[PDB]
From a paper:
Among the different ion transporters and ion channels localized in the vacuolar membrane, the ion channels of the aluminum-activated malate transporter (ALMT) family play a key role for the transport of chloride and malate during stomata opening/closure. ALMTs are also involved in transporting various anion including chloride, nitrate, fumarate, tartrate, citrate, and malate. Here we report the cryo-EM structures of ALMT9 from Arabidopsis thaliana (AtALMT9), a malate-activated vacuolar anion channel, in plugged and unplugged lipid-bound states.
From the CHS-supplemented dataset 1 with no malate and dataset 2 with 10 mM malate, we unequivocally identified CHS densities in the lateral fenestrations and phospholipid (PL) densities in the pore (hereinafter called as “pore lipid”) in two classes. The only difference observed between the datasets 1 and 2 was the presence of a malate density in the pore of the dataset 2. In the CHS-supplemented datasets 1 and 2, we identified two distinct classes in the sterol mimic-bound state: “sterol 1” when one pore lipid tail of the sterol mimic (CHS) is in the fenestrations and “sterol 2” when two pore lipid tails of the sterol mimic (CHS) are in the fenestrations. Unexpectedly, we observed that the succinate head group of CHS interacted with several residues. Similarly, the succinate head group of CHS in the lower fenestrations occupied the S3 region interacting with W120, Y208, and R226. Additionally, the TMD of the sterol mimic-bound classes is similar with those of the pore lipid-bound and peripheral lipid-bound classes, suggesting that plant sterols may contribute to the regulation of the clade 2 ALMTs.
Author numbering:
A (entry chain A), B (entry chain B): 80 to 278, 298 to 434, 527 to 570
The structure:
């Protein structure tokens, strides 16, 4: 609330500050009777132009400006091509409204068509207003010019109070998310083993749903200038996305491992207490490796001159040896109820899932090496 | 586009129709010079009051009306308690704007606080306008009354053109979604078995993400009157949600089964070709049962006087017998590389997952029976 995210306390304040500034400006002007009654547009612009991050603000401003200008020009021209049709100037002014409304509503229901929705809305609004009002090219331009000088003040105050007072970036957000994802999967892999051997959802149910957010953060960050520890005009951000994509593949195996614990068919504790010492070592080595990788990502450091996938591999090999030398406790070998014979293969399923998780750890290391190459990570 | 969802072609048209009607109305009035320049509010209301479904429209209208009235009253009173503070009437009018902006921004960043965001926005807008304009209780009420009679026309035309011209309901949407979810999981369970035995994502990746949509549809439907095949003042809709919740539990097992096919460690075809005939029967029986349940839900019919969980159970028992009489091909029993010994337990994992899926099918039947009881399904 007040400690989970300090940024939420600075953004709001910024907003308030902007509003105050606008008010002060309107108070500094002389007693103009037409500068005080059109002040609801500056307030609307001030509260509608703010965005959390710099890249999102920049993209929204660019798109909105282009769409507003295009729609305004086309809607001003299409209400002047309509006064020369002749005597068909009262069925056309009734068919056009219907067609424009239909097109505007149609363009909004399809997610694919989302960059051109705003322009269409602006065109619909402007065209309908000009026709129903009774205005003429000369009587509408004066109103536009009169009520656009209180829109540009709000737009430039909102744009001045965001890029120079505690700027908030998106690349840092992506970096923090990646770190928290390595740490969530490391914190869940231990809890699944402990939950199986004792007689774990927040880490595998946050990494798998964090693809759309990563894509949006990357899209926002591609609209930002060089700053701080990120010095370049083409900074590799898809190499950060690829690492999370690789980690999600392992998080799926952790998902299956947790789901094993929630089945109707379960094995007895006395049969699962034979592999406790073998499972614990893998469950600790995997988490250690994941935390080491997360920390290296956080500090922006290249991998050392020592192999990092040795201890987990040795632990997996030992587990495989123990399984091979104890397989008689998993299947019924005297026939070479069904529930009794099916409750013993759960251990085999769990061990196979753990081995699959261990084997899926090379792609993460490969992605990290590639990222460190393209981003110029400092030597250890 | 034009055939995937016919409703998308009727809604838009409705919108256009509403707009046309409004235009016609404004044209029917005499040449009023103040009834034509305030016509951008009726258009804004017309395009802002439309919703796809009836329940969503009703809920939004209720919430917006209450919040608008509350905020308008409080913002009219708080700009009249401010002219009696005395000589501290110019630092208070600067501190209040900042505080109000801070509070409005704070109330928006928290998803929990979402029913009271609109009222706060309205209060902020009204208070800031009254202060910066220079208005008095008597000079603002006249403007409000003048520009609210073109807002109520748009609101009642949008509300009249939606509830009586091709009404669209949400309960039908929930019903169709449930049916398509039973059919997606039935279409994926077959493709996972065929993909494993040959030498399947749309059905298990649509059911698991359809919980928020079901909750929203249920919330919207609780705001609708009796109609058609749904005749009651308290219609059980959470009993429809519970069935999908039960089916998702099995869809997770189908997820694991599909994920088995995408592992680095795979078994040889010659070893997996021994259980083909046993796996095919279960893969067909499960889909048949799921499709039977989906069809019964679609037609609103009670279950017959014959057990529906017999064939799948018999198939699972046969698979368990075959596994018990062929287990020597899964493990190395001569020690009572690691990859060779670990590539043979994949069959055991797949069979265990399939048996778990088969066992998780009683909860779905139980939920369907309960729903048919509370919803009064017709006898077969
Ligand atoms: C923001 C409204 C505050 C409360 C207003 C009191 C109720 C008045 C009744 C009349 C209805 C007018 C308010 C309806 C607003 C439309 C809702 C909406 O879709 O907006 C998105 C968005 C609301 O979406 P939401 O966040 O999901 O609630 O913002 C708005 O509410 C209105 C945004 C318009 C402000 C732009 C003004 C800047 C000057 C130049 C404008 C040129 C473009 C004009 C086209 C703007 C299209 C909106
Ligand atoms: C002609 C150029 C060289 C100088 C002037 C450019 C302006 C015409 C542009 C710059 C930023 C634009 C604004 C960018 C963002 C918005 C908010 C935008 O917000 C919405 O569209 C509603 C909310 C939403 O859609 O999310 C409404 C128009 C507006 C004020 C734009 C109006 C036109 C502005 C002032
Ligand atoms: C309705 C008929 C009779 C007249 C034509 C309707 C126009 C209002 C449409 C047609 C083309 C549209 C434009 C098509 C291309 C663009 C560029 C487009 O580029 C982007 O996508 C910006 C970057 C991004 O955000 O992805 C921004 C909006 C805009 C100007 C659109 C605004 C609305 C326009 C002018
Ligand atoms: C080449 C140019 C023409 C492109 C950019 C034009 C825009 C700046 C236009 C498009 C729509 C115009 C707006 C259209 C509708 C209105 C509302 C209109 O509202 C009223 O009805 C005033 C009277 C009242 O509300 O009582 C006042 C002007 C204004 C804000 C206009 C301001 C200028 C806008 C944003
Ligand atoms: C006093 C009672 C007995 C009769 C009059 C009630 C009206 C004051 C209510 C009924 C419906 C209300 C409208 C309901 C829906 C909207 C759309 C609403 O949309 C938005 O809030 C912007 C878009 C969004 O937030 O999604 C803006 C106010 C408005 C027009 C409301 C204005 C107040 C209205 C007309
Ligand atoms: C800022 C300070 C100095 C003055 C008080 C601010 C008000 C504008 C707040 C305080 C209580 C708020 C109200 C609290 C309770 C409700 C009922 C609330 O009920 C619902 O939740 C409707 C059903 C739903 O959609 O869930 C609808 C909005 C409203 C009137 C809120 C509108 C905004 C209010 C009046
Ligand atoms: C007990 C009552 C007072 C509760 C309901 C009051 C609402 C109907 C009020 C709240 C805010 C009011 C609006 C406040 C701001 C405006 C914009 C204002 O815009 C102008 O600045 C007109 C001149 C111009 O735009 O050039 C015109 C009146 C209007 C729509 C008001 C219409 C009536 C509203 C919606």
């Amino acid at each position: 609330m007040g400690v989970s995210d300090p940024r939420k306390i600075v953004f709001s304040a910024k907003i308030g500050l902007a509003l105050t500034i606008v008010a002060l400006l309107i108070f500094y002007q002389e007693p103009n009777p037409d500068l005080s009654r059109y002040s609801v547009w500056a307030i609307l612009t001030v509260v509608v132009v703010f965005e959390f991050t710099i890249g999102a603000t920049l993209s929204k401003g660019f798109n909105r400006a282009l769409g507003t200008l295009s729609a305004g020009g086309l809607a001003l021209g299409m209400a002047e091509l309509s006064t020369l049709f002749g005597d068909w100037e009262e069925i056309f002014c009734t068919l056009s409204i219907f067609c424009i409304g239909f097109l505007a509503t149609f363009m909004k229901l399809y997610p694919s068509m989302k960059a051109y929705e705003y322009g269409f809305r602006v065109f619909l609004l402007t065209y309908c207003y000009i026709l129903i009002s009774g205005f003429r090219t000369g009587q509408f331009i004066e109103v536009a010019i009169s009520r656009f000088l209180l829109i540009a003040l709000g737009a430039g105050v909102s744009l001045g109070v965001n890029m120079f007072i505690y700027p908030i970036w998106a690349g840092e957000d992506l970096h923090n998310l990646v770190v928290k994802n390595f740490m969530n999967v490391a914190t869940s892999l231990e809890g699944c083993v402990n939950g199986y051997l004792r007689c774990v959802y927040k880490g595998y149910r946050s990494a798998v749903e964090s693809t759309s957010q990563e894509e949006s953060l990357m899209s926002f960050a591609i609209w930002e200038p060089p700053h701080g520890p990120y010095k370049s005009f083409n900074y590799p951000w898809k190499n950060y996305v690829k690492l999370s994509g690789a980690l999600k593949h392992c998080a799926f195996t952790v998902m299956a491992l947790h789901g094993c614990i929630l089945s109707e068919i379960q094995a007895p504790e006395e049969r699962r207490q034979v592999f406790r010492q073998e499972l614990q070592r893998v469950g600790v080595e995997g988490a250690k490796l994941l935390r080491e990788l997360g920390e290296k990502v956080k500090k922006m450091e290249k991998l050392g001159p020592v192999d990092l996938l040795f201890e987990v591999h040795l632990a997996a090999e030992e587990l495989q040896h123990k399984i091979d030398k104890k397989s008689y406790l998993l299947v019924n070998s005297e026939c070479w109820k069904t529930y009794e014979s099916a409750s013993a293969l759960s251990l085999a399923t769990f061990a196979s899932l753990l081995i699959e998780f261990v084997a899926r750890l090379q792609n993460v290391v490969d992605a990290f090496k590639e990222l460190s190459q393209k981003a110029n990570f400092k030597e250890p």
